[PDB]
Structure formats: structure tokens, C-alpha cells
Curated annotation (Swiss-Prot), chain A:
Induction: Constitutively transcribed during vegetative growth, with a slight increase during stationary phase. Probably part of the mutS-mutL operon.
Gene encoding the protein: mutL
Family: Belongs to the DNA mismatch repair MutL/HexB family.
Residues of the full protein shown: 434 to 627 of 627
Superkingdom per UniProt: Bacteria
Lineage: Bacteria, Bacillati, Bacillota, Bacilli, Bacillales
UniProt protein name: DNA mismatch repair protein MutL
Phenotype of the disrupted gene, per the record: Double mutS-mutL deletion strain have 40-60 times greater spontaneous mutation rate. Cells lacking this gene have an 80-fold increased spontaneous mutation frequency. A double mutS/mutL and a triple mutS/mutL/nth disruption have a 200 to 280-fold increased spontaneous mutation frequency.
Main function: This protein is involved in the repair of mismatches in DNA. It is required for dam-dependent methyl-directed DNA mismatch repair. May act as a 'molecular matchmaker', a protein that promotes the formation of a stable complex between two or more DNA-binding proteins in an ATP-dependent manner without itself being part of a final effector complex. Overexpression of mutSL partially suppresses the high spontaneous mutation frequency of a ytkD/mutM/mutY triple disruption which lacks the system required to prevent damage by oxidized guanine (8-oxo-dGTP).
Amino acid sequence: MDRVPIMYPIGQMHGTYILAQNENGLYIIDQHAAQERIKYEYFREKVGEVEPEVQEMIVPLTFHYSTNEALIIEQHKQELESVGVFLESFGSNSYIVRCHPAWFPKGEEAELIEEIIQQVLDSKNIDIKKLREEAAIMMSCKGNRHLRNDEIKALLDDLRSTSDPFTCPHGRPIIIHHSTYEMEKMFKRVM
Amino acid sequence: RVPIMYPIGQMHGTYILAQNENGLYIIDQHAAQERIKYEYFREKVGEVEPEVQEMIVPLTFHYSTNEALIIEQHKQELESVGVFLESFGSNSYIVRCHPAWFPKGEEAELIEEIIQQVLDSKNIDIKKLREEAAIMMSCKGSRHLRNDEIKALLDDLRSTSDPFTCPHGRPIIIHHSTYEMEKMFKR
């Protein structure tokens, strides 16, 4: 797939669409879809990394489980480990977490860790590929402003760098393009 | 009947981008400017006695016998659009004046063009010739637009009888409505 060429901001509208252009023509961009594409690939890359920078917690977290649940979790300890969940056995069906990747959404670590662990519970069986995918989604969730052109330019540069600037992880188009040729044809003035 | 359009910007020195509650507007500057000029000239050609201006450089025209017949048949029609032909013998005329509001410096070409429309139609009435002439006038005349220029254009275009379509029937505006944009991005 050809990489989209550098795009330059024209402006925005309604805190919803970005208007940009280059020599090729006009780009109309759903700014929310763009942000989702950018965020997903960021976290998906992160969770794939082999040795993240870890952050010890001021206060260690605790989690307690049934004999059924703790057992599911036990087989999948490798998987959870790779997604940034560092469980430490303290007793029967119980776990402690003292640290996490530094790139976890700040201040929502505990919620995230529980949700990841919950995912493994609900499926009973699951592999790294699907878990890493689910985890990056949950991370992208963590939390209509009208963007200035400097913020727009930053977003466009970031979008260009992703593996798919045209369609978001959930199937939404991100970009609608009218080439200069297409624009001339639509106005029928010079063609 | 578009509401106020607020500028987003311009591109390629050719297109203006604008928005309001109804969505996105992409405007061809050149076509917009002709629609704006047309609204003006259509009014002007409708005046029974407009301000007239003597020419510094009078024009001469020669026609075939049959063309001159057609020209004489349409004396009233031609005068109604500001073409004041004066007979001087066989198949020949001079023009010594014209409305002050004829596009400056392009009077000679315009007059010749208007007469040729009459010759080609063979028979044409005042209403249709006024329309054709105003279209011709609106296409006469000669960097990126400044912000005041963009606002003036948007307000002026909006103040015409058809902001969407040019005197020649081509689009002035490509409009992606809120509804259409939501569909495009499958929201």
C-alpha cells in the first residue's frame, strides 16, 4: 500500500471534520476515526513489545478469585504477562500486582488490569494474538473540541505514519479524497 | 437559499471551503464571481434608460446584406442591451457610445459578440437577448484570496438568486450535507 503523501491543514469544522490538502487535492478527514486509528496502533505496538519499562506502584493491588477462576488465570499467566499484567501468587486463588508497564493509561491501571483479567475469564480459552488485540482496544478506550491548525498538522503527520490512514480499526472510513482532477470534473468549468 | 457560510479556508488559489449547520461547502471561486457579476448585469440590462458614455474610440462594423436585414429587424432588441448601431450606408454601422457599465476595455468584443448572437438566432426577443447579453458581460473581466476577499465572496454569492449554479448551468458549489457526511464516514 502506497503511503499517503504529506497533508497540510486547511482548517476544521464542528469539532468533527478536518479539511486538508496537498498537490493531489482535497482531504476530508473524520477526526475521531483518525484518532482511533492512531491510538490503536500505538497501544497494539506497545503490548507487543518484549521488555516494557515497568512502574512499581505506590500501593500494591490485590485480586481474589474462585478455585475455578484462579485456575483459568494460572494457565494463562504467560499471556497476561505479555499484555502487561504481572500477577504474583499470594495464596489460594489470590494474586498481587506490584508493577505495570509505564505506558499504561495513567491513573486507570487498576481498572485496566481487572478488565484484561476479566476478558480471559469470559473466554476460558484464548491466545496472545486475540488477547493483545483485546488489550489494545481496552487501552484505547481510556480517557468535539475544535482543533487548531498546529494540532491538525500533528494529527495528519501521525495518521500518515499508521498502517492504514484510510480506514479505522472498527471499519469506519477515515479519509475521503477528491483529487484535483476529480474536483475540476465536478465543477465542469475547465473540463 | 443557503444560510451564512463561515470560511474554513482556501486551496490551490481556486477553491473556497466553508461550513455552517448544514454541512460543508466547496466553492469554485471563478464560477462564484461570475454568478455575482451576472446578478448585477442582469439588472443593468433591464433599465430602459441607463447611463450612457461616449466612446473615445468609435467602432465600425460591416455586414452582409442579409445580416444587415437581421440587424435592422432587431434594432429595438439591440438597443435594449446597450448596442447602439448607427447606419452609414450599405451594410455598415458605427458605434459611438455604450452604457457606462459595460465592462471597461472589452466593449468592442462584447458588442460584436451580442450582435453575433442576434445573427445566429435569426429571430430573438428582448427577454432572451437580455439574458444572453448579461451572461456575456458576466464572463468578461480579468494569488490566494485574502480573508476579507473570501468573506465578501461568500456573502455576495449568498445574496444571489442561485448560489449553487452558474449562469452557464454549471455547479458553483459542491455541498456535502451533514446527512451525506455522516453516511460517507459510516457514522
